[PDB]
Amino acid sequence: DGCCSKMGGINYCDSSAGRLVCNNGFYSTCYCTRHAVMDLQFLMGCCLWHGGVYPQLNSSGLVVCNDGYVSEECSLQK
Amino acid sequence: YGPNAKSMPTEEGIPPSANDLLLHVLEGVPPPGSRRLVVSGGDARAWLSNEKMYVRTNLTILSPGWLASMTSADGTHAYEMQKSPVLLVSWHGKVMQLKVEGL
Amino acid sequence: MYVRTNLTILSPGWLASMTSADGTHAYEMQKSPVLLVSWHGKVMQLKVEG
Amino acid sequence: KETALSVGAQAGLAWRAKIIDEQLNKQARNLDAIYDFNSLVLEHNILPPVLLEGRNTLNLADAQSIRISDRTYKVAKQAHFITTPPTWRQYLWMDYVKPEAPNVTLLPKTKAEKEIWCIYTERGWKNGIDQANTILEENIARIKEDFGGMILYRKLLAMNMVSPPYVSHTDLGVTGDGSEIHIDDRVLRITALPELNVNSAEWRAAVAK
Amino acid sequence: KETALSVGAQAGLAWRAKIIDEQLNKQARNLDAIYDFNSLVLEHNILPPVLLEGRNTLNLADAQSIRISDRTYKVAKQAHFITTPPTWRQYLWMDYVKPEAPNVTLLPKTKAEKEIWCIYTERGWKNGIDQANTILEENIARIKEDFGGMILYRKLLAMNMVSPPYVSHTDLGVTGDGSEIHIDDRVLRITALPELNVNSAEWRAAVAK
Amino acid sequence: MKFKKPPINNPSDDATIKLAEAAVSVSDSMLEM
Amino acid sequence: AKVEKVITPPSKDNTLTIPNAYNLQARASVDWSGPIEELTARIAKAAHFRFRVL
Amino acid sequence: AKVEKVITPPSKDNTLTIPNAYNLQARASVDWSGPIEELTARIAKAAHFRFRVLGKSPSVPVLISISTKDESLAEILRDIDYQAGKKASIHVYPNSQVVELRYAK
Amino acid sequence: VPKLPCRVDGACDATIIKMMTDLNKKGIKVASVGQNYLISIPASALFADQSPRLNWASYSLLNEIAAFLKQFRKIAITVTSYSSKYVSVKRERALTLARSRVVSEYLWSQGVDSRIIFTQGLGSDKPITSYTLGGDRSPNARVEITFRRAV
């Protein structure tokens, strides 16, 4: 939990790098701005690699992405 | 051309140059009437005005394919693109994924 | 230069193109002494004097 | 009990989708290693078109009506421009939203109800696994077909079966009004789509050693 | 809970606005030190026009249709006179009205409600801080864009790509009736706005050592 | 042997940071003109 | 690859325009999937050579 | 890609080689995007060389664009030759210190 | 945001500090300046006597230095080797190059988080100590590994 553990502590959140500054002059392992380098390799959501979900709602759960492509896995079944 | 004419002749002209909003985009001023998009994962800003994404970064875009792009004097990149929630970038030979909420 | 035919040019690229329903084409271009026109799968070269 | 079947289907499908997504992420370098479209992008950043072939065609139209052919070819998707190369993640990634809302309506009070609840959930688990596998197989078939189409286009291009796409370009100077200016208006235009030649005598064969 | 989110957003927004206004005051000399609009005025007390540039322009207009150019230049704001030079205070100052009436009708009753009320107010506080930073970033981008536009106009005027403004002034001596008199009347007007040229022959270049 | 680095100061602020980010670009552009 | 190799005979090799000299016998391994410019700049920095763009 | 790639031998290369006279060994930070004639004339005057032309400019002159900070003017002329290509030629005479711009027809 | 990782995965600055202290009391040089880092290793704990062969207990130290390298994000790492003048110049040049090549191959086979590895072996052309009395025990024969930590 302690970002600058075994160090002095937190000085300030440098928002240019999005990183905390420890009392010793070393960048901590923590993050302090969401605009930092995230190595995202896995996500959530559905109708991905498309236009996302359609804004409309159906009586069913038949969700067709905004590219015009149907998403049966995201939709319900029988 | 008579009032009962079968067909007007089909035209063909010079395709348009670009969109001038990208200059404001690369300068950082959002275009008027647009709303902001929350981006998390890298270093970019994004707006939505006319059902098309407008982003500003220094990175390079891969996945959805952009409609038009502009390059700054110092190399800052601005992109006009079809709408999508996900982006794929190459940073320094390493690939990475970016997500956009609030579409 | 303005060229009127029923064919399609290949080499210079038009600056403004027009066509009709029955197949008549007209092209406006910068002046060039040579042209390339493809017709029905075979590509021919044309010389024009100006 | 039907609710138990449905939530078993949903939970098994979601779990299998998550496992197959991380397994697809495990071998990420090999995917773009083998499916390199960037090698096959043409010189004017134009995607080469898609060709399909068939061999030993026979059709019986009705009685006393038989039509046969040796091979055939078909253009599937016409060639067009591409700003960026495609990737396999446009073909193979699975959507994942785990549903976690089983409404508290029927919950098994007898041990027999618990056991049939378990086997109904198990059946739904099997069904969701099967559905995820079929979806994966469908996507694999699609991307295999498109990659085979591009490599087939290059093959019969070498065999001299397609006219290569002829594209001109008009180059201008500066342009605009007194207020706005451009520098060098270059407009590119493909006036010749690729198509098959039908004069077969010009076809070029091949030999090996 | 939505009330907790709203009051957290309002309180964080107001507090961060007050802090950033104090820090903006703390560097008062440096702001108008680096944004010298007063040096940038032309000799007839006239604000220079604003210009924008763009490099390596391409566009796919539709399928089979692309147009490229090296650079473009666009007039952003037309040249006009100014009584006084502008400063940063009409660009970067935050409007600060301290709220004092948090209406608390909904109230937590137990410890769980109190704790989630605390964390929801914390979330709203964070969101208000982010909104304040967003507003500041947009403002500084706007003023930097305008300043860069004026220095770009000076750049291209030194490059001989635009035309300087042309201004006439007509002078009359003693004027007015027997009841009111103006002893002189110098009236001036700009006869031509500055604008780019399309003739390439009048273009100078630059070198360094 | 507790390690450190020389330059340490009082804690900074993001508004000042992005003001510097604008300022350096303004400085170099006007320097070249 | 077999059919295109047999239909078009080879003519040249890039080793004519690419010779080899000293401080080029270093070894490397890589995983790069981006533009060419940073990669070429890094390899020039390894080579301690001048870098030129055209 | 190996068997399909097309190259040229360096003996037949149509590129401007380095003239390496002493007056060409300076640094210059130049950004430009426009015509050619004033650029090469002003380069020659910065190098203290004379300058002349032969041929004629066409209806649309050749447009070039170069941005750099710290690189020799000989390399500037080399990149000018590479941007021009076929319709334009550039010669440097160091005996009588002149530069020559040649058009095509 | 709960899906957002709060830290870079598999990282703890306390562990970084602790293993740095363990290396420095183990007797191998750790150098930190700016965002750049350099590690210096004596050859006597690594190879045989002027020989491009690996002692079997050195896999522990190589795993330890791999575990240290697993705690940063980097682009390019350069390794280099130095020796003493033994018979020729060419002999120890090729020896240092082969030593650097082998250790580079093993550290690549260990899953280091990097993009580019550079191998350099020079020999006895750039020593750092005039006192060259010892042989392979002398610290001028060495291996360094250096990089810059980006962001």
Side-chain angles (χ1 to χ4, degrees):
Chain A
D1 47 358
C3 288
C4 300
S5 180
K6 293 293 223 309
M7 277 176 171
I10 315 296
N11 308 28
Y12 58 96
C13 164
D14 191 4
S15 325
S16 76
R19 304 295 213 103
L20 287 181
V21 184
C22 298
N23 282 80
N24 319 34
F26 302 99
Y27 287 97
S28 153
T29 69
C30 285
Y31 298 142
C32 80
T33 314
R34 56 137 39 85
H35 306 156
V37 185
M38 304 296 112
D39 336 337
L40 304 187
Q41 308 303 126
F42 172 60
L43 281 93
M44 301 299 193
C46 111
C47 268
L48 265 69
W49 273 256
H50 282 282
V53 300
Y54 209 79
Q56 91 107 23
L57 57 105
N58 200 321
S59 53
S60 67
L62 192 61
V63 37
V64 173
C65 319
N66 297 291
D67 304 15
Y69 178 54
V70 196
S71 312
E72 295 86 350
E73 13 71 22
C74 187
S75 170
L76 28 70
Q77 68 273 44
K78 175 58 211 57
Chain B
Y1 287 146
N4 56 336
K6 48 152 182 293
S7 159
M8 302 288 106
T10 59
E11 240 288 335
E12 207 288 322
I14 293 299
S17 83
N19 182 30
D20 311 9
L21 276 314
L22 280 320
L23 316 169
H24 293 269
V25 167
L26 87 102
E27 283 297 318
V29 35
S34 52
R35 78 157 187 256
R36 280 86 45 86
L37 314 174
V38 38
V39 205
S40 296
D43 181 29
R45 300 302 109 88
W47 301 266
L48 165 72
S49 105
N50 282 10
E51 302 84 42
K52 297 176 191 313
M53 298 161 46
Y54 296 83
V55 311
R56 157 170 180 256
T57 174
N58 287 320
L59 269 305
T60 312
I61 322 291
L62 282 320
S63 36
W66 36 266
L67 190 55
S69 176
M70 286 305 298
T71 312
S72 76
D74 37 4
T76 315
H77 286 12
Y79 291 84
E80 155 84 310
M81 192 187 256
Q82 241 292 329
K83 56 173 62 174
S84 61
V86 280
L87 278 320
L88 163 67
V89 293
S90 180
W91 186 36
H92 286 85
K94 156 108 74 169
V95 293
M96 254 164 295
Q97 313 196 23
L98 246 291
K99 67 170 187 176
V100 172
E101 279 194 6
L103 223 175
Chain C
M1 46 169 42
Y2 316 122
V3 271
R4 163 193 188 88
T5 172
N6 298 270
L7 306 179
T8 307
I9 333 186
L10 295 195
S11 32
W14 32 258
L15 91 101
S17 162
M18 262 319 289
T19 177
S20 61
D22 61 325
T24 302
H25 295 266
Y27 298 86
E28 313 180 330
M29 281 120 53
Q30 200 273 135
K31 309 159 298 304
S32 89
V34 293
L35 305 172
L36 193 72
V37 164
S38 188
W39 150 64
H40 279 177
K42 61 213 63 52
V43 183
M44 315 303 299
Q45 184 265 356
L46 312 178
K47 163 67 179 55
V48 276
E49 171 260 1
Chain D
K1 41 153 300 153
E2 309 178 0
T3 59
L5 296 161
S6 294
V7 300
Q10 242 80 6
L13 172 70
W15 179 90
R16 187 55 174 186
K18 193 167 179 179
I19 297 306
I20 198 179
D21 264 329
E22 52 86 18
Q23 261 298 135
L24 191 58
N25 189 272
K26 197 80 63 179
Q27 256 43 250
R29 284 308 290 176
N30 315 27
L31 308 180
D32 70 285
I34 64 179
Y35 298 134
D36 182 30
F37 305 96
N38 191 24
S39 67
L40 249 299
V41 177
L42 311 170
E43 62 271 39
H44 282 32
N45 315 83
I46 159 172
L47 167 69
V50 192
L51 263 304
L52 307 180
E53 71 102 350
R55 296 190 180 172
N56 199 4
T57 275
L58 140 78
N59 183 29
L60 176 93
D62 51 307
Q64 320 188 29
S65 61
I66 305 100
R67 166 163 181 178
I68 57 114
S69 170
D70 204 299
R71 303 194 194 173
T72 190
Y73 295 87
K74 171 161 183 292
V75 182
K77 295 181 173 60
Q78 197 62 221
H80 65 99
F81 280 141
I82 32 165
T83 153
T84 56
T87 157
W88 53 268
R89 327 187 112 277
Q90 315 164 354
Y91 284 78
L92 256 306
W93 185 257
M94 294 290 197
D95 290 312
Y96 164 69
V97 174
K98 178 182 179 175
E100 305 94 351
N103 47 350
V104 264
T105 67
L106 45 104
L107 278 317
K109 46 258 178 186
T110 91
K111 49 183 191 70
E113 276 203 0
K114 293 170 228 306
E115 290 192 353
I116 66 189
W117 176 87
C118 285
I119 69 187
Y120 283 161
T121 331
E122 166 259 15
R123 285 172 179 172
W125 206 264
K126 292 175 161 52
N127 293 319
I129 285 173
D130 296 326
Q131 264 80 92
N133 297 324
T134 51
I135 288 302
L136 158 90
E137 199 267 352
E138 171 93 0
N139 281 342
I140 288 176
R142 198 114 35 97
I143 187 54
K144 161 74 176 181
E145 179 254 22
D146 268 336
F147 219 77
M150 264 87 76
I151 197 65
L152 180 57
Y153 166 72
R154 181 56 82 87
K155 168 85 151 190
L156 49 107
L157 174 61
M159 220 95 270
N160 189 25
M161 307 304 187
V162 268
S163 42
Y166 199 89
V167 35
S168 73
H169 45 273
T170 51
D171 299 341
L172 319 174
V174 294
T175 197
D177 72 324
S179 169
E180 271 63 50
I181 210 63
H182 287 48
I183 289 304
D184 41 355
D185 345 321
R186 313 185 73 207
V187 173
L188 266 65
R189 256 299 188 192
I190 329 175
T191 65
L193 274 178
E195 60 180 339
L196 287 318
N197 38 47
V198 86
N199 36 343
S200 175
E202 298 89 307
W203 293 2
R204 193 58 251 120
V207 83
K209 280 306 280 287
Chain E
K1 39 180 299 156
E2 310 311 294
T3 60
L5 294 178
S6 304
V7 300
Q10 289 288 143
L13 183 60
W15 188 88
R16 193 56 193 181
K18 189 195 176 189
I19 297 304
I20 197 187
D21 254 352
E22 297 144 4
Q23 262 56 234
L24 197 59
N25 176 42
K26 205 162 55 190
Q27 261 45 63
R29 282 305 301 174
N30 330 64
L31 300 183
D32 33 22
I34 66 164
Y35 292 114
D36 192 356
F37 291 87
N38 195 22
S39 63
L40 249 296
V41 206
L42 310 179
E43 88 298 321
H44 272 35
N45 326 118
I46 158 183
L47 172 78
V50 185
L51 260 302
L52 273 183
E53 85 101 351
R55 289 180 187 183
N56 194 16
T57 308
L58 89 155
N59 177 37
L60 168 124
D62 45 326
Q64 212 187 7
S65 66
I66 42 179
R67 173 174 174 185
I68 67 121
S69 63
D70 160 61
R71 287 169 174 175
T72 43
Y73 294 83
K74 179 174 186 310
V75 167
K77 283 184 168 55
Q78 199 44 243
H80 68 87
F81 285 90
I82 43 168
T83 289
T84 59
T87 144
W88 53 269
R89 252 297 167 87
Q90 58 271 54
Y91 276 88
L92 289 328
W93 183 255
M94 305 283 107
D95 294 5
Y96 171 73
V97 170
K98 174 184 148 192
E100 289 92 10
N103 167 258
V104 185
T105 56
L106 232 199
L107 184 74
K109 312 303 182 196
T110 72
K111 45 170 197 60
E113 320 168 21
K114 286 181 262 297
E115 151 261 338
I116 65 191
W117 189 86
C118 290
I119 70 187
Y120 283 156
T121 47
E122 168 263 5
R123 285 189 174 92
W125 189 270
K126 274 296 174 55
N127 300 132
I129 292 176
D130 295 10
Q131 283 200 359
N133 299 130
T134 321
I135 291 301
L136 149 90
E137 185 255 15
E138 290 154 324
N139 277 59
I140 64 157
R142 193 174 294 103
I143 184 55
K144 174 246 184 173
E145 161 254 33
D146 274 333
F147 216 75
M150 270 167 304
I151 201 58
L152 251 292
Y153 164 69
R154 187 56 70 86
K155 239 287 135 299
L156 271 328
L157 185 50
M159 214 51 179
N160 196 15
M161 307 304 177
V162 305
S163 177
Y166 181 71
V167 38
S168 180
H169 42 41
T170 64
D171 15 313
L172 312 176
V174 34
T175 163
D177 73 318
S179 173
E180 288 80 16
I181 267 184
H182 303 346
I183 72 155
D184 63 317
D185 219 0
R186 301 231 31 163
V187 185
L188 46 130
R189 42 227 282 98
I190 34 180
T191 95
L193 272 313
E195 88 295 326
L196 275 288
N197 44 53
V198 318
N199 334 341
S200 60
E202 315 90 297
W203 293 16
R204 58 194 160 202
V207 84
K209 299 301 285 289
Chain F
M1 302 64 61
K2 305 198 297 183
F3 316 98
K4 219 119 67 177
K5 290 303 181 64
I8 45 170
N9 291 84
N10 315 90
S12 301
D13 181 77
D14 46 357
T16 343
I17 288 165
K18 55 184 61 57
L19 277 180
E21 285 207 13
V24 291
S25 41
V26 167
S27 71
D28 57 60
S29 328
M30 175 233 24
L31 177 127
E32 86 90 10
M33 74 83 28
Chain G
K2 279 207 303 307
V3 64
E4 67 96 2
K5 150 83 74 60
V6 79
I7 196 47
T8 301
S11 65
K12 290 300 295 171
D13 189 286
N14 68 331
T15 191
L16 183 59
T17 185
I18 306 301
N20 37 310
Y22 207 68
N23 62 272
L24 248 169
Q25 306 321 108
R27 323 224 75 94
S29 32
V30 78
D31 177 29
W32 190 281
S33 166
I36 96 172
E37 278 67 25
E38 305 176 334
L39 197 49
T40 46
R42 215 65 52 90
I43 213 53
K45 181 184 171 184
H48 332 277
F49 272 17
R50 289 216 41 84
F51 184 75
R52 207 171 62 182
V53 277
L54 289 94
Chain H
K2 280 198 305 176
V3 89
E4 84 101 359
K5 207 222 191 69
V6 36
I7 57 178
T8 162
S11 62
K12 309 183 182 63
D13 277 355
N14 309 336
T15 168
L16 168 66
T17 171
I18 298 179
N20 57 87
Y22 188 75
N23 309 23
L24 320 173
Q25 318 305 307
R27 344 263 67 258
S29 188
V30 180
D31 201 339
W32 168 262
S33 182
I36 168 177
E37 323 274 301
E38 66 89 57
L39 187 57
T40 174
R42 226 199 35 94
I43 278 299
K45 201 150 301 171
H48 298 165
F49 279 61
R50 312 199 324 270
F51 157 74
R52 52 167 164 259
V53 287
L54 76 150
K56 200 187 70 57
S57 174
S59 67
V60 177
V62 180
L63 315 177
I64 46 184
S65 89
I66 272 296
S67 181
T68 174
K69 315 295 284 299
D70 295 312
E71 154 266 9
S72 156
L73 52 136
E75 317 307 305
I76 279 299
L77 290 182
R78 191 187 187 94
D79 213 304
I80 281 165
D81 193 22
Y82 182 64
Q83 286 195 355
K86 44 172 296 181
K87 321 130 302 298
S89 307
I90 157 180
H91 281 52
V92 34
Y93 295 93
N95 30 12
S96 63
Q97 296 177 334
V98 83
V99 291
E100 182 70 76
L101 187 64
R102 190 168 318 169
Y103 278 104
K105 289 178 180 176
Chain I
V1 190
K3 308 304 162 302
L4 288 178
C6 55
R7 52 161 172 264
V8 43
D9 50 340
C12 176
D13 53 320
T15 60
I16 286 181
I17 286 300
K18 188 186 191 314
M19 68 179 144
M20 184 179 309
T21 324
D22 294 357
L23 261 55
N24 293 317
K25 72 167 55 187
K26 236 58 177 181
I28 39 193
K29 201 63 219 63
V30 182
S32 169
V33 46
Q35 67 266 13
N36 307 24
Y37 300 94
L38 297 103
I39 307 298
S40 183
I41 309 299
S44 298
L46 227 169
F47 305 96
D49 306 338
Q50 300 163 343
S51 310
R53 213 204 46 81
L54 254 64
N55 313 29
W56 213 84
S58 57
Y59 275 140
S60 57
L61 245 296
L62 251 45
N63 282 259
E64 200 46 63
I65 194 181
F68 180 76
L69 203 130
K70 279 273 296 179
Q71 303 296 283
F72 309 92
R73 297 187 198 178
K74 68 227 61 58
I75 308 298
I77 328 177
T78 60
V79 299
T80 168
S81 177
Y82 299 89
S83 67
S84 163
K85 170 77 178 73
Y86 175 53
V87 160
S88 92
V89 273
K90 186 174 300 175
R91 196 257 175 190
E92 72 273 31
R93 274 188 175 181
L95 165 69
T96 46
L97 173 117
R99 283 181 169 192
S100 56
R101 180 179 179 196
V102 165
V103 67
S104 69
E105 196 204 12
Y106 178 64
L107 69 93
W108 183 281
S109 182
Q110 301 292 141
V112 290
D113 226 320
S114 44
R115 319 255 50 81
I116 310 104
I117 293 301
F118 285 150
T119 71
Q120 287 288 84
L122 267 310
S124 54
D125 21 18
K126 301 297 156 290
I128 68 175
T129 304
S130 66
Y131 177 71
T132 73
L133 209 137
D136 291 10
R137 302 288 183 167
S138 174
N140 42 18
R142 61 191 188 269
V143 265
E144 298 92 310
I145 159 180
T146 140
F147 69 100
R148 155 173 285 188
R149 170 188 188 166
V151 188

